[PDB]
Amino acid sequence: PDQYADGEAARVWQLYIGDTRSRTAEYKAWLLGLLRQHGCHRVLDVACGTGVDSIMLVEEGFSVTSVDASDKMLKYALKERWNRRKEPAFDKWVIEEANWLTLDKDVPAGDGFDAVICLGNSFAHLPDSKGDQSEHRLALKNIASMVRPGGLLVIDHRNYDYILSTGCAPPGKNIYYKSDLTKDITTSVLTVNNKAHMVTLDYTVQVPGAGRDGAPGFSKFRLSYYPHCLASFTELVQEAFGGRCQHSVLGDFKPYRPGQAYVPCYFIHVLKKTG
Amino acid sequence: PDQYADGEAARVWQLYIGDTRSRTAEYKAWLLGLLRQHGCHRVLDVACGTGVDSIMLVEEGFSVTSVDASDKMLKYALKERWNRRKEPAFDKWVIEEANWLTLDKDVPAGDGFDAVICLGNSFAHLPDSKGDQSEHRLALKNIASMVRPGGLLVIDHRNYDYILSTGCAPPGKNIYYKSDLTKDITTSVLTVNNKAHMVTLDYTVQVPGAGRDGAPGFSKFRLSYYPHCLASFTELVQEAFGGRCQHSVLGDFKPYRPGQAYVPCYFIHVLKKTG
Amino acid sequence: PDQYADGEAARVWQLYIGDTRSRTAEYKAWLLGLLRQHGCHRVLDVACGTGVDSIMLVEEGFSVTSVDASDKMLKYALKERWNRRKEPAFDKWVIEEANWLTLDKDVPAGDGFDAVICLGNSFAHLPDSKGDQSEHRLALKNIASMVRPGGLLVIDHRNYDYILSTGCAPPGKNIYYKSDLTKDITTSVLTVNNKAHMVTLDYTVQVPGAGRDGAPGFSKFRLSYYPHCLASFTELVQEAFGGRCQHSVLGDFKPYRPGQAYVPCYFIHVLKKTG
Amino acid sequence: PDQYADGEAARVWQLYIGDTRSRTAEYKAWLLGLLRQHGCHRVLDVACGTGVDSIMLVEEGFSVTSVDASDKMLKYALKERWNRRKEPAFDKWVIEEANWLTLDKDVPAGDGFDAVICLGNSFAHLPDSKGDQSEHRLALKNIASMVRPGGLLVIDHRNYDYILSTGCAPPGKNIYYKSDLTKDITTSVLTVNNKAHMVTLDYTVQVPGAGRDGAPGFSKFRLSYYPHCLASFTELVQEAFGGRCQHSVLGDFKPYRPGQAYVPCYFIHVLKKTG
Numbered sequence A, B, C, D: 001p002d003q004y005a006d007g008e009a010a011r012v013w014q015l016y017i018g019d020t021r022s023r024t025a026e027y028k029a030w031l032l033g034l035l036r037q038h039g040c041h042r043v044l045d046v047a048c049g050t051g052v053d054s055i056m057l058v059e060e061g062f063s064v065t066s067v068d069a070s071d072k073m074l075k076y077a078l079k080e081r082w083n084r085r086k087e088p089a090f091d092k093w094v095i096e097e098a099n100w101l102t103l104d105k106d107v108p109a110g111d112g113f114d115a116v117i118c119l120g121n122s123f124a125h126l127p128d129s130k131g132d133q134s135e136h137r138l139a140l141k142n143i144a145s146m147v148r149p150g151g152l153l154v155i156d157h158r159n160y161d162y163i164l165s166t167g168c169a170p171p172g173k174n175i176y177y178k179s180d181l182t183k184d185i186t187t188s189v190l191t192v193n194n195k196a197h198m199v200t201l202d203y204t205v206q207v208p209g210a211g212r213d214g215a216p217g218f219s220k221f222r223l224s225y226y227p228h229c230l231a232s233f234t235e236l237v238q239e240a241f242g243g244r245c246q247h248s249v250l251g252d253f254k255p256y257r258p259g260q261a262y263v264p265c266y267f268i269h270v271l272k273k274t275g
């Protein structure tokens, strides 16, 4: 289930993110700082999407290769690369299809990458269908398996500890998706027995115009995520490295202490493989 | 959406109810008592199902006509009637297809019935698709419209105030469905925005045998209900009589006071129309 | 694939057949004569449908048991039986669900029946999905397996030698379905590679009224048949008896000689199982 | 209905065509000759597919822009362009998504192209759903509307006059698809009433290997075409130019005279707009 196969979400992703520059303005300093601090040059983006963060890293002189399971989303990143094909940096940008579940065979890590990134609440898309989080563990394993020792892994997820609690996803401004075009997002929590099983969001993004004066137009699409509670993900992700890692998490790219006033919309996990 | 069209549920309903006699043993005293107390002879069963309670009322000398929207379920009640066709009582039992939504035209009440019954958590099946409980109000209206003034309406529903609260449906023994054959029931609560929208139960009933020594067999089916909170249903049902009624509700056919120790699995609403 | 599961066809079958009495008027003399001529008293109807011919045989003093795979169609025959439950003849009419494919286990022939009937182009419904006519052979075998030695089997089918040739099904009057209510029947022939694989008919039967003065209403349903060419069926059906049978075929219940002027709409096969 | 959306056909198209060089060897001389003879430099390919003929034209120094409705097929042409991005010719190759039905707005012809090509039996994919060949006429209109006056249009189609007649598509060698990997092609002709409505082909292409020694593997996909009889297409296509055109048709890129011994697998229509 690509969940993006229909292509409606991809078509308007640009409208969903809003000003990519304005979005990337946040955490660019941190991501870049972190990357450089650990002398990272080879970066693998497993959540490429339309290329938002891959493009940023490419421009910033990193050697990036981006993968994604949806060729509908990737098709836009590719489009961008071609458009800037005359730029040496972009001439060396690698964009290929791949799936976390089969990453190991999709992207030959070989020596591995200096850093791996999964941003914008991409991982939560993986379902627990098997009953046990086996799929979660496997995918989380392969992704970590792409990290060269001493390398970095930056994987995030929406704050579901809050969505599950209030039953609603935070509205408006978002560090990853900030666009006045997104008119509505309806949260749908499904709890099997007494455990949260799935959070389904239904977006309503206004396609610029979609009608002459007096008639506005919108695009509607739905995405489903597994609500990973912070504590659980921390445990899950660390386990993916068999413990040989240094773990840490930030609020919205800012330090995070449980009980703090500010409630983050996303939780960024920073893991540094050790051996 | 018959929800019973597939016929899997009907096929094993008998296994789900278990010992009908043992089930009917409960409340038979009360239902009969209540019926007689109000001199009721003409009884309409809008939730006929396989005929459990209609059959009981027939045997008890009442003049009953049973309707139901699922011809898959009704098909078993009919089967029963034929088998006992030699019994005068059963020779006068009426079984026809009908839908609460169109009852008014499906069952010509005319003068009306002395009593109407909807038992076994049948009504909760009606969805709120329209956004507003309009369908609920309409169906609840037609059903009440079949009650002769001074007549009775006995409509029940699972205690969803508890299911919604614990996220799980009560396990094991049940006054309506008590069978050791039912191995599992998985509750699935769906809350759109922050309001409970639907409760989906997934039953696992062991079909006797379904395999030689060493191999047991089961049947799996799913049913979805609108979680009507007590307070809301009391208001809804009373409104269906335009207020010309006498309302009351019992726990599991026993007096019910909010805050009482015993937590009822079902809530039985007893309404007596006045004119 | 019940093909009748949706119930649209059953709901208006009555309208499709038209005047059952006028329909049964044809071949009633022949069927009855044939039956009596071979001293048949126990008759099994494997294509019961709504009960048209079973009812006729019941009224005529035969001891009939009718089976059918569609409970949507059977549900009407049952309805009829109940309505005439006070008639001794109908009190002894047996109606049950069964499938040619599993007839042997569905209907315990035991000694077997004096005659078996499959009329109204019922058998052609069986598809050749398996690639080989295995299903046809098996079903045709079980059906024959219900015939007591010296017994009779009356199985028919539309004249597909003609439908395949003209690509269109004969219009209007029909010995089995004669109703001015049927406004249209669109034939759809599907030939895989160069062999006829399936004939799909789309019926348009006008439901009486379905609208006030000025607005008429119709019902639309589709049925699919395997186009059995005469020669092939003769071979197939005889083989079902392992050759221990006396075969013959009539046009529309009249003698049939290939090349004759009159083009039959149906082909009636009469087989007499022999030692 | 992309008909290619699933992507199974695109994934193995390469295997279906076989040796593109060997395929393109045929008619390359003619296509090129014809193009040059009319001094054509700007070529639009509306059936781009994986880029087979567009690539050939690009290499041959033409200025080509390719469009196609399936992004699953186009995605491969794009892949090819990128790989040869260092070749000036390919740096100027334009590849975009478009649909014959909306071509006029998808590809701004403006002045128009010197030549337009639709090869490999692409057009026959367009269905007649509307009842009337309106869609055929519209699409055929837009495509022609891309031809600059004095320009050329090369549109082909399988010889359905033969497929319809023999009920089977020609086997083996094919000028457009010649690969020993294609193990089977099952034709399926659907005739509504007495008119041929659709021809559905089911391909079985062996994916190289798909299993170790002893186990071979295949890929199965289906495509549906409208069987355009020669005479009809000639009329249809000419009408698309409002008669201001010079029409002609060849067998398999060789002169064609009705009744000739050789039976072409495809019919290539060559139109030269005058207006």
Ligand SMILES: C[S@@+](CC[C@H](N)C(=O)[O-])C[C@H]1O[C@@H](n2cnc3c(N)ncnc32)[C@H](O)[C@@H]1O
Binding pocket: A004, A017, A046, A047, A048, A049, A050, A052, A053, A067, A068, A069, A070, A073, A098, A099, A100, A101, A119, A120, A121, A122, A123, A125, A126, A176
């Ligand atoms: C929220 S989008 C990413 C948006 C982009 N990263 C951003 O920040 O705007 C999540 C992406 O996850 C990808 N995805 C989901 N499941 C995947 C899997 N199993 N393997 C690889 N990619 C997957 C999808 O194709 C989708 O584009």
Ligand SMILES: C[S@@+](CC[C@H](N)C(=O)[O-])C[C@H]1O[C@@H](n2cnc3c(N)ncnc32)[C@H](O)[C@@H]1O
Binding pocket: B004, B017, B046, B047, B048, B049, B050, B052, B067, B068, B069, B070, B073, B098, B099, B100, B101, B119, B120, B121, B122, B123, B125, B126, B176
């Ligand atoms: C749980 S079953 C009843 C079982 C039976 N009362 C018993 O106690 O075993 C609920 C019934 O509601 C009926 N039902 C649901 N929607 C209906 C409608 N709109 N009109 C009539 N019956 C309806 C179904 O056909 C189904 O048999």
Ligand SMILES: C[S@@+](CC[C@H](N)C(=O)[O-])C[C@H]1O[C@@H](n2cnc3c(N)ncnc32)[C@H](O)[C@@H]1O
Binding pocket: C004, C017, C046, C047, C048, C049, C050, C051, C052, C053, C067, C068, C069, C070, C073, C098, C099, C100, C101, C119, C120, C121, C122, C123, C125, C126, C176
């Ligand atoms: C054309 S209808 C019969 C109508 C009826 N004979 C009459 O003359 O009005 C054909 C019947 O064949 C039955 N049928 C089809 N496939 C069957 C199967 N495999 N086993 C038993 N009955 C089957 C259907 O349920 C359907 O009612």
Ligand SMILES: C[S@@+](CC[C@H](N)C(=O)[O-])C[C@H]1O[C@@H](n2cnc3c(N)ncnc32)[C@H](O)[C@@H]1O
Binding pocket: D004, D017, D046, D047, D048, D049, D050, D051, D052, D053, D067, D068, D069, D070, D073, D098, D099, D100, D101, D119, D120, D121, D122, D123, D125, D126, D176
């Ligand atoms: C047989 S394939 C072409 C293969 C390629 N031209 C060759 O010669 O090998 C037909 C193509 O028609 C395209 N197609 C079908 N309907 C279309 C439409 N309405 N507009 C544009 N392209 C369409 C499909 O996407 C498909 O790739």
